[PDB]
Design a protein around this ligand. Structure first.
Ligand SMILES: CCCCC[C@H](CC(=O)NO)C(=O)N[C@H](C(=O)N1CCC[C@H]1CO)C(C)C
Ligand SMILES: [Co+2]
Length: 163
């Protein structure tokens, strides 16, 4: 099913999402609907709160060389925790919950996270570049944070301007 994406300035997006404890058919149904919604919206990631589900789960699917997203490359990341973070990097981001606005955000250049997949299997993943940025963007959503919150004095005025 295609789900409605929640947009700024909805206070729903400030929710702190809750850990997933039951890795069952309902979770898989929710993840499938998130994937459908993310692809239909031409995103490369999506956090559950963006479709109104305050659960600590997110998906990421970066496109290949043919510029398309293959479902087999999708990461389903549940109850993630940062283990290591390193360096800094600027990246120009937009967000499905803040549509039409793009700005450079300072992110960690490299991260390592631990999380569970849809079968409750524990994973450790190291990431850099776009994958690291996507991980950080989506985890921020689980904590009620939007990328616009991370902008400077100046770049925030540019946000209010384009608003
Ligand atoms: C880059 C880190 C965040 C990526 C995830 C977001 C989707 C989102 O809001 N998830 O919470 C996205 O797909 N954003 C796209 C985006 O910002 N992109 C797509 C490729 C790289 C970057 C633009 O530099 C826009 C165009 C919809
Ligand atoms: Co977003």
């Amino acid at each position: 099913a295609l789900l409605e994406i929640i947009h700024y300035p909805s206070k729903i997006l400030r929710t702190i999402s809750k850990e997933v404890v039951s890795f069952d058919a309902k979770l898989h149904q929710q993840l499938d609907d998130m994937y459908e919604t993310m692809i239909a919206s031409e995103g490369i990631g999506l956090a559950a709160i963006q479709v109104g589900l305050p659960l600590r789960m997110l998906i990421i699917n970066l496109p290949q060389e043919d510029g398309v997203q293959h479902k087999e490359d999708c990461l389903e990341i549940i109850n993630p925790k940062f283990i290591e973070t390193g360096g800094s990097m600027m990246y120009k981001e937009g967000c499905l919950s803040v549509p039409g606005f793009y700005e450079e955000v300072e992110r960690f250049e490299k991260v390592k996270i631990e999380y569970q997949n849809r079968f409750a299997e524990v994973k450790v993943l190291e990431a850099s570049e776009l994958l690291a940025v996507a991980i950080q963007h989506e985890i921020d959503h689980l904590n009620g944070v939007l990328f616009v919150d991370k902008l400077s004095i100046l770049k925030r005025k540019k946000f209010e301007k384009e608003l």
